[PDB]
Amino acid sequence: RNKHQQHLAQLPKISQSVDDVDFFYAPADFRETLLEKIASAKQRICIVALYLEQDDGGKGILNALYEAKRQRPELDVRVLVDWHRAQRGRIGAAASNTNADWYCRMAQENPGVDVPVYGVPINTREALGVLHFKGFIIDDSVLYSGASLNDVYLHQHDKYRYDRYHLIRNRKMSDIMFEWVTQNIMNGRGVNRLDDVNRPKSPEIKNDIRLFRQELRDAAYHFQGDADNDQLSVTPLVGLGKSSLLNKTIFHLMPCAEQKLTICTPYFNLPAILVRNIIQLLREGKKVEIIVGDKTANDFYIPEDEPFKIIGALPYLYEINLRRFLSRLQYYVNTDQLVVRLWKDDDNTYHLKGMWVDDKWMLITGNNLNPRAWRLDLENAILIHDPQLELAPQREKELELIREHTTIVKHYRDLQSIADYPVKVRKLIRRLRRIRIDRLISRIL
Amino acid sequence: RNKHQQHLAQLPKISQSVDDVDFFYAPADFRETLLEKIASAKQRICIVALYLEQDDGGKGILNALYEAKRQRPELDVRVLVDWHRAQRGRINTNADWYCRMAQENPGVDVPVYGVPINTREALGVLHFKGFIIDDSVLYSGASLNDVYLHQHDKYRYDRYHLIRNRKMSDIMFEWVTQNIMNGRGVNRLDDVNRPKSPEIKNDIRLFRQELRDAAYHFQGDADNDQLSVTPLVGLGKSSLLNKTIFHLMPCAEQKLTICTPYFNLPAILVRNIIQLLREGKKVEIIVGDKTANDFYIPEDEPFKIIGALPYLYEINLRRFLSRLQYYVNTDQLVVRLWKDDDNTYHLKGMWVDDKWMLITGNNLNPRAWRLDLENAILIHDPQLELAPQREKELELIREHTTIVKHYRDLQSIADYPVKVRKLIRRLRRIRIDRLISRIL
Amino acid sequence: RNKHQQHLAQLPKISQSVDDVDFFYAPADFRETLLEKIASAKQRICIVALYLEQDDGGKGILNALYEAKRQRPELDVRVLVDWHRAQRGRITNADWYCRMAQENPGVDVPVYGVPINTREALGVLHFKGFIIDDSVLYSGASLNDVYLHQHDKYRYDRYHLIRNRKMSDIMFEWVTQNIMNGRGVNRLDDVNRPKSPEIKNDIRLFRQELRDAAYHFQGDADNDQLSVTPLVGLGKSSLLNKTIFHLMPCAEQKLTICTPYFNLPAILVRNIIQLLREGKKVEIIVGDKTANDFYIPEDEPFKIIGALPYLYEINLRRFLSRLQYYVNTDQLVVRLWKDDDNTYHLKGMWVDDKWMLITGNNLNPRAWRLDLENAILIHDPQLELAPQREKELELIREHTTIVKHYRDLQSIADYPVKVRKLIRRLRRIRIDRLISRIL
Amino acid sequence: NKHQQHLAQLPKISQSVDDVDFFYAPADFRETLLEKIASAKQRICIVALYLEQDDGGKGILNALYEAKRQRPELDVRVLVDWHRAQRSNTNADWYCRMAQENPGVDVPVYGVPINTREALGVLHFKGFIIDDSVLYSGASLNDVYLHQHDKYRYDRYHLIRNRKMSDIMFEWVTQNIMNGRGVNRLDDVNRPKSPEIKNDIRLFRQELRDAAYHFQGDADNDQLSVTPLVGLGKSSLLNKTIFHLMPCAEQKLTICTPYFNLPAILVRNIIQLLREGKKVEIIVGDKTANDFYIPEDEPFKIIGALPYLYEINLRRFLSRLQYYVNTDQLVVRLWKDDDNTYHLKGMWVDDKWMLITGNNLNPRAWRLDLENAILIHDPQLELAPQREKELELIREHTTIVKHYRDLQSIADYPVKVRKLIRRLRRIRIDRLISRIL
């Protein structure tokens, strides 16, 4: 076998029953499933998310957690979110009380009921590392989504943020992930409770975070494979930095496409190494599908009527990336090998991640497949190997619905050029490219 | 509550008996108390100081340490001083002397460790303070030499508090053990073969980073209605100490009092002072006269470059007062100059109304805020149980003070001796005055 | 008018008679014309070239110079070449210039070396012009076997004779004052000529003097008549570079470019893309990799330098790749020149039927910052040179293939193994980008 | 003084005089290696810079396969430099063939990358660990190092039987190298290419920067001892020990190095010794005994300038210290034996200390490469017969240089060499070269 298939063949793999894999296709279903599993949990609930917001959606979840712990005080309930994100407003907000302040109030308003909220700092400053580990571990199941917990991710109140949602019942995998979180994160240096009113400030734990990050640089799942390559399997993956096992698996996965590779990413900003792989596939005569958001389906996009702000330039920069890429590969568009899809559904937002390799592999991940995710953030995934096509109904239904709100881009010219952009945007971008800062921006966001 | 009181309300606090807090008001009493506690120590003696001098005063202390260890060989005796300071004269070293002492007293184990807080003295010194003896901490800003201990008729005024408290002393003893004594780049000064600074340069860099977020970790056992003590330690701008000093000042409902030897407040503390004055509160600032500074050189003697520092601190005070003369006039801002013949002034601390007392080694200058390893104890006395002692201490501090009623009462550069005047004009020409105020 | 046309409208321009502009279409004709003009020169001969080679071709020229000076000792004969290039083999001439001077006593034919920078790689003499009395015979060609089509193999350049008293004076006088009498210029026919390190500081000061040396003359011609405008430059903000930049957008119909080494600076590429967007036409005539003088046949032993033609091809293929849409609409036309193992050295710019830039400028980052470059800008608003312009382009194109698709150009995968390995090594560490800024 | 203190307080493993065997010739070393491979019962760990696809190297690899066939429970490992092994048909390609032609027999060959590119770090760790012994030489495994086929490369050869030391070294290799990030099998046809593991190597190198032997000293300074040492970078324990070792010479310091290119700090030490009135002996190869030397008849190549550059270094050094040559304090020896090559490393401090090492004592070894050594302390002179016999034979093919002028100057060098060197010194690249080779 070639070195890429060898890498995948020799991945440790946990066996998996087809009956124990449930897909969900809409953020509202995901909300309800999460609540249902919280109610019916008997042993443990481990909620890892980027953030858990002080809004109707997030309240719903935290209240359901307190309620489940009240009814079963022996239940092991933990919430882990990003340290930095939990201690600030959203970008350029009027700004108010933070999530961490709210986690404190909740703990005081519910004495006796023990629902600890830990802040994980992946780096000393947010811009240099965030907690992109994903997983709701409930007893022997993992409900895995890219979604954080807020109004739009949960489709409270009429506007939504599109993600993917998979429930996987598997004792061994959930144990491995629960145990990995316990040892490496929860009991890690520089993790600190956010429900403590006296929680340290970032500068005070700066050195703890540095040592923590180094500990994480080679923390990996350790378990023995129980499944061969002829049966349905799942392989949990985790990584921080360029040489993580996750990153290596993503790298090797792409060339194993004998027919077609499909990619979702919210922000089109692939590292060069993944681009080179894409081009190799196209040269080998294979197919590559790339599903990204329209600029207007980006959560930083500011309507052209409203007052423009600096941050509302990001969707434009991602479009410029897409247009540059397509430009170079228009030949392959024409041969129906390269297919680029733009998702758009009124003013809802796009947050799909993942990778399909033929009909046999499905990577579900929190990984945005950008330079940030490749070096800076703590990322994880589950790799589903389905050599017998047992998930084919669900795989196909999921792709059906993902594509439903998509336009195919048949020509790079169908994408607006900088000339077509609003005036403030146009001036900003020209200023940035003059001094070459566009390249820096694409490596930090 | 406002965010400042909230910070203080939520500080972990160790309970404290009023009977177990003893003030001393004079450097001589402090000397004798130190010797007494060294004699009667049963378990441990941990002496942390900036330096321990090869003079009558310092000898007294080191001899008392050797003597106590001879009489009780199971006693855990340690001395920690600044690495760089111990290996130079003022502007045959102490470290050389520590070596002789160890050779002249074989069998008796009194280790003297040098702590380097940075690779060069100018970029970090050991301003951690504390004599930990069994279950007590005798806390002063004083190093151990002739003047600090008032050997031989001339003295250096500091503050002196003995606090008997098992938990606090344990926390401080244990913190020193783990972070300093067993830290990288700490090296024995009683070893004749001790490395030279360049050889341990990388060790010191790693050490300093370890220190950047080393803090006391302990659970509070006391509420805000009872007498409490809270040990604090820090290195650099965002330490818990620095934050507590920052939040402490605005909690003054009536009056804030500050001692500092060298008037050279960082901007952030100045802004706080001005806010208090604007809110209609009172602010008392007790500093030394230029002549009570230890770098001051009488005008008869040969002038040296270093003897310009007291003048620079006066210029700072005069500039500050100048801007706030309105508040002087309303009897809100009170500036006191301490002066007692040619004795020297080394008072540090912060009083918030009648309720809080910060005792510290912190000179409240930019150096202490970024570069040096600093610590303190925060006494919360919500019931006024220390009121007799607090008032007696302030009584005696003020006794040798003049109140400055007008910034003009302070000499201007024009009034200074000629060599000084020329030096200062040269410095301000090239703007080095601003740099000096950030490194001393 | 837009700022680009304004720049051109306000250029000083010297008037020019259509009868006094003669094109030549082949390197052999150029050789013979040069010899003819050397024989018949009456007042001055100023030969500026990158180099004058110690070969049959170069000998021919130097001998013709000595001979003309013998027959007219009052004739002012000067030869200026690059200081560094004259004192090395290909990857010396100065030694040969010394012998010549000794073997011809009494006859004064001075050969000066111009150092444009302290090291060759940081500046060469790309000034061009044979100034003979009141004429300039202007070519990109140096003087050697192939440039002059001695002995059966040739190097294709362009050749224009322009009789014009004022222009030739301006150029002759500019050379006199700024180069010949410049610091750090040194005779190469002197056996005792200094070594580069000894004049290092002279060269630094010289280069700074050159950084703002420009032609100064009053325009005598409007924009409704045939004109010529001499241009000269060193570094990013030279008047030449500005004129090249402004020239391209004035194409109302079509821009044509010749360059030997396809390696356009980004700013000129952006212009090209703007033209294509405005719906105009752009023609680009470059050499096939095999028509490059560094190309080594695949049978022979490969050498490191024989990777350059490949690097230029990679540049062309990357460019075409991004603009394939415009190829398809017949707007963008890329031509590869190739004629057995002869080599390609065409430079210039055509703006519609109205402007013709003839230059030594390779239109690359090197020429834009490092080298001393010059040109003549011919403005022909009345189409008086149309017969010759069209005949010249006819013959240039004759040995060309049109590239209809970027895929028609070989990719790195198709290259020989040693080449392939070298290029992959270079791109790994990103040195390909540096190379493109120094060659 | 602080130097003796450093040495006094080194942890030291005790050692029996009976369990130290010297060998004096590359052929004996070959045969000893083969003998110990045959008779190994528990483990064979072969660490070398490279193992060549030639008669000499084949001999060794075949002996390894053969021993593993006859005792499948035997723990056989080969570790070589990652980059060196992969430069048409490479050693790594050959290691692959060998593994395919010998199925069932498990002889893993791992490539250690000490840096992302060869020029910035190589595996200069040395040691053949066989059961409870270490056969320690600077030699890699090829024709000349093993004196197959009539031409040889002179190195040093010591067998030290010592359970504890061999365990420490075997265990250190296991944990830090074999199980280290970015170590990769060279007998795998699908082995990654350097760029793919670039980040692994960076993290690996940082792990190595403070990997050191950890063990408790069992021996005082009045008895025969050995102290294994290992290091990467300026502040390694090895480098510190080499630095402190030199000033402890009460009488004389002896140094072997193949390429005379001492760091300034070691030069300063040398000068101090000479000033204190002590003796310093330096044994290097003649330019012609360097393996990059190209005879003047053959076609010159750029790399064949290195022996000349090392000579220029030696001549510059001697020039400055000619006074001490004259007082018979400083003694410089040039080794030369027809067209055989010189690869001696080590340090003798009086009659009491012997450093055996792979360390070329140059700036490269001081910062870039993974180096190790064994430090033998012999305060009772128990190894005196062997020490003296070894030095006897080392010196046998040596000329003493009595005057710096006896060394050729740049003017005397062949023309292509002369032009190259003048070009290099013009732009000051000579100084850079001396820090990377």
Side-chain angles (χ1 to χ4, degrees), chain B residues 181-285:
Chain B
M181 208 186 66
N182 299 349
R184 287 176 142 291
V186 171
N187 275 285
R188 289 191 53 170
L189 290 165
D190 54 359
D191 179 12
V192 284
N193 291 307
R194 61 189 175 279
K196 302 198 176 175
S197 294
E199 299 189 326
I200 49 164
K201 175 145 189 151
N202 194 248
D203 302 43
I204 298 170
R205 286 198 162 157
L206 291 177
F207 181 37
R208 191 183 172 65
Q209 284 182 328
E210 293 165 5
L211 288 178
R212 271 166 195 238
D213 54 54
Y216 297 136
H217 288 99
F218 69 91
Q219 210 174 336
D221 68 51
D223 62 49
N224 310 310
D225 285 7
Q226 58 181 112
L227 183 61
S228 23
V229 298
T230 311
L232 297 162
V233 68
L235 174 74
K237 293 182 179 199
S238 48
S239 71
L240 172 58
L241 170 57
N242 290 358
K243 290 207 214 201
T244 298
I245 290 175
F246 167 82
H247 283 296
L248 198 43
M249 299 171 77
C251 296
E253 273 216 307
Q254 304 293 348
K255 176 162 163 205
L256 168 74
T257 291
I258 294 180
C259 286
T260 178
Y262 326 110
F263 190 82
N264 181 22
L265 291 174
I268 196 180
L269 297 191
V270 169
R271 212 191 327 291
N272 278 3
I273 285 168
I274 287 166
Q275 198 49 44
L276 282 169
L277 291 176
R278 283 173 172 176
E279 292 177 5
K281 317 296 179 54
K282 290 176 137 242
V283 177
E284 199 181 24
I285 296 178

Side-chain angles (χ1 to χ4, degrees), chain A residues 59 132 198 215 422 428:
Chain A
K59 285 173 193 149
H132 267 296
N198 292 305
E215 291 166 3
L428 174 54

Side-chain angles (χ1 to χ4, degrees), chain A residues 197-198 201 203-204 207-208, chain B residues 10-11 209-210 213 238 243:
Chain A
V197 283
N198 292 305
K201 299 270 164 186
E204 299 160 32
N207 193 247
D208 303 44
Chain B
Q10 298 173 337
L11 271 181
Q209 284 182 328
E210 293 165 5
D213 54 54
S238 48
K243 290 207 214 201

Side-chain angles (χ1 to χ4, degrees), chain B residues 302-433:
Chain B
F303 170 84
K304 274 280 172 184
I305 299 85
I306 198 70
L309 285 181
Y311 293 93
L312 295 173
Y313 294 123
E314 194 176 61
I315 293 162
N316 288 356
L317 186 63
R318 194 184 136 113
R319 188 177 296 119
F320 167 84
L321 267 179
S322 166
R323 119 98 293 225
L324 302 176
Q325 183 62 51
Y326 170 87
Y327 295 110
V328 169
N329 296 344
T330 72
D331 289 293
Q332 290 185 71
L333 180 53
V334 176
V335 173
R336 290 178 173 286
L337 291 184
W338 186 98
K339 155 68 162 171
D340 179 18
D341 308 314
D342 62 321
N343 299 291
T344 54
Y345 179 95
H346 202 240
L347 303 190
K348 311 104 179 287
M350 205 164 284
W351 293 256
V352 181
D353 303 316
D354 49 1
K355 306 274 212 154
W356 302 87
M357 294 173 64
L358 193 80
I359 65 179
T360 185
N362 193 309
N363 288 321
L364 306 173
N365 67 6
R367 187 183 177 58
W369 209 254
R370 300 166 206 193
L371 295 182
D372 313 327
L373 174 68
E374 292 289 350
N375 83 333
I377 300 165
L378 179 58
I379 303 174
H380 188 217
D381 181 20
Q383 298 307 320
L384 310 192
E385 299 186 68
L386 293 174
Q389 290 159 285
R390 191 184 63 242
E391 289 176 54
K392 190 188 175 181
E393 195 190 20
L394 277 168
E395 194 206 15
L396 296 166
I397 285 162
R398 292 185 178 116
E399 179 178 308
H400 289 313
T401 68
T402 285
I403 298 185
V404 186
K405 285 279 145 99
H406 200 270
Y407 80 92
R408 285 184 139 234
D409 301 347
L410 298 173
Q411 294 186 337
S412 60
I413 293 174
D415 289 296
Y416 292 155
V418 185
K419 292 149 168 184
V420 175
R421 197 163 70 234
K422 282 174 178 167
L423 173 53
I424 293 165
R425 289 179 186 171
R426 187 149 58 247
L427 285 171
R428 265 148 71 263
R429 197 226 277 175
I430 59 186
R431 291 212 226 124
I432 285 181
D433 58 288

Side-chain angles (χ1 to χ4, degrees), chain C residues 140-155:
Chain C
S142 288
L143 301 168
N144 77 358
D145 276 355
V146 293
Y147 277 118
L148 296 164
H149 201 175
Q150 220 93 2
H151 302 323
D152 225 297
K153 175 180 161 151
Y154 72 93
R155 188 162 178 71

Side-chain angles (χ1 to χ4, degrees), chain C residues 119 197 425 428-429, chain D residues 117 195 198 426-427:
Chain C
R119 297 194 153 101
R425 189 127 223 195
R428 196 147 298 132
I429 58 187
Chain D
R117 298 214 265 102
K198 172 148 187 149
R426 196 143 301 130
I427 58 187

